[PDB]
Symmetry: C3
Subunit: 256 residues, 3 copies
Amino acid sequence: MLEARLEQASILKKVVDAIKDLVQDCNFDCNDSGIALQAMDNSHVALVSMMLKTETFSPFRCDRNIALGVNLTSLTKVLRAAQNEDILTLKAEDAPDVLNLVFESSENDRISEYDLKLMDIDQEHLGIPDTEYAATISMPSSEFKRITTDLMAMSESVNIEASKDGVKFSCQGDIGNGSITLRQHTNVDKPSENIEIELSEPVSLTFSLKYLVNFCKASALSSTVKICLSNEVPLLVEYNISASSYLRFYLAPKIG
Amino acid sequence: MLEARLEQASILKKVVDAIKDLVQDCNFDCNDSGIALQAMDNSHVALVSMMLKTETFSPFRCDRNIALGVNLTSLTKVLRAAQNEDILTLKAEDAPDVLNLVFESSENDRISEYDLKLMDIDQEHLGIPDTEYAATISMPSSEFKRITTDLMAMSESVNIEASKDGVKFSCQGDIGNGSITLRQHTNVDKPSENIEIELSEPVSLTFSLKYLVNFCKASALSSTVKICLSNEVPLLVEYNISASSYLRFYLAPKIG
Amino acid sequence: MLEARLEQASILKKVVDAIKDLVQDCNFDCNDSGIALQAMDNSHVALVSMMLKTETFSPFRCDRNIALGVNLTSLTKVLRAAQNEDILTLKAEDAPDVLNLVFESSENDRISEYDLKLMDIDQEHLGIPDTEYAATISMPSSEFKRITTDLMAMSESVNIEASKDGVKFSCQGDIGNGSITLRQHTNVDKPSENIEIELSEPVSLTFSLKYLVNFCKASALSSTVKICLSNEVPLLVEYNISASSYLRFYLAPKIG
């Protein structure tokens, strides 16, 4: 059976909010190692890859594998009834018809309990191979959110060009051409504002801004976002929820 | 004639906002004792009962009975032009065609004056008899607002079960079953957060969440809300605006 | 060629936001003295008159006259990508196809650059003669915003009556009659709250509230607003962005 406690419901609330606009029906794959999610968005363009590792929970138990077929709009209805600082416990039996969710107030000793009906969802689960990326940009998540948000108003597409010195986001639109250039930047007393760029080779590729804006709905999960460009494989946009757990989005560059 | 001063327009603004989504056309019944309102909602399901007692005003005058036939969307248009800390004065002559409203700024000596046209509205005014309730729950208004709001997303109905120890809100929905359980709770240094439950006998009854959400639009009038359950008479949900005045909502439980 | 730096993008952002709901297609007339705008609203009722004088920029260069034909919804798309505290530089060559806009971050050394495509817009540029106004009311911009906003909910029209003592805004609506009366008011320790009224002769005239609400979208440009009434010429509603620069709106009173 499954039994998993988060100290703050916050983490799960943020996770689901970061996925639900891309994916409606998906499985949460529970086992020894934690709770994973792997699903394409509804248009079958982007791949969503979540791993909530056992260390993120406190405590965590999952004896046998359990696939929790969940509608995310249904789960969002439940999770909105959890406050961010509620102690959250997930429970599910072997061959579950429901996922049991318990939210416990910190002070006033309110206890909320929901039995969310599960459904039969077919898994796809593509193989995510190991990869050495051409360029990796680490920057504040709010800045990447603003960039994609600003350019989206102007264009459907953004060219991302990585160099040793910096990274340039470029687009052409009906109103004109635009670009936003960031270069490596370090603040001793505000290291959270740092922009760090590691380059093994030049990479200049074009991506859907609409998908990038949706990826930036994970901005609440982490202060920093890792943008990983490759000339061979899809872009990886990574939010590390903790030392262990991550929410990842994969997006292929646009090819004629 | 009528002449009634509130120190802060706030009280009246909050009152009307707490009623206008339920009732459009209603009478304000003015006399010696203050200003009352008694009207069913537009679907004729819930009863709204307001009493602004003479002690709430400063000063208060009403020589003879005057029924002020008012459209609440029209009055809302006027009251939005009063700031919360405006000194508010209501005036009306015998056999009035208009209600006169005067809002006086605290500092900058702005004076606003409106003559709201009255209309012919037929009164119903049901007899509200005296009643010994099976269970009375006193809790913070924000908590009851959150509860009803959260469950509304999931269900049209909520079962409220009162015991000595606690109170359970339960519902069944398309997405599953849910419940929120509160028990008696007292904080010495934050007594405003206290949950107090007085029970003469067990009561478990089902009510419309949509009506309860609308009742919770009075949450600004008082930090505390009194929920009064009976096996004989409709539920009473009470907001005490001051020691004297109250806004009350009555709702019959659902019966097959 | 044109080259003009603002210390804070804020000024330009606020300016364009204050005009775009009235005017879509307009010219920015650049020369020695600064950057001007003069255009009627889309219904050809109100006249918009902006002057950003050379002293407002730091530094400013414009060798020859350049008319920058701009769509304001297109420019708004660009300016939303400038943060309020960005150093903003406008550039344009002689016979320009584009306006070049550069936004430079204060700390993290982000640089944004846009080439906004210009268009062929015919100028009207009416003669704005010099005028001695019957009454001039100087008051806080937020108060005028609130007044027009409040009365708009009730009426399409507002009568503005100026006297030595004070100014009265009056309207008749379907819900009734309303008025807001301000008188001369001075606070030694909060002079920004002051209401000052200078009268050479009585003036009582009626104006469109819808136009006045739109004029109040310039409220962010200045803490104080100057309302200038005349029995001969259109009302002038003036926002002084700095000692030099201004955004002005002209509106003729309603005549049968």
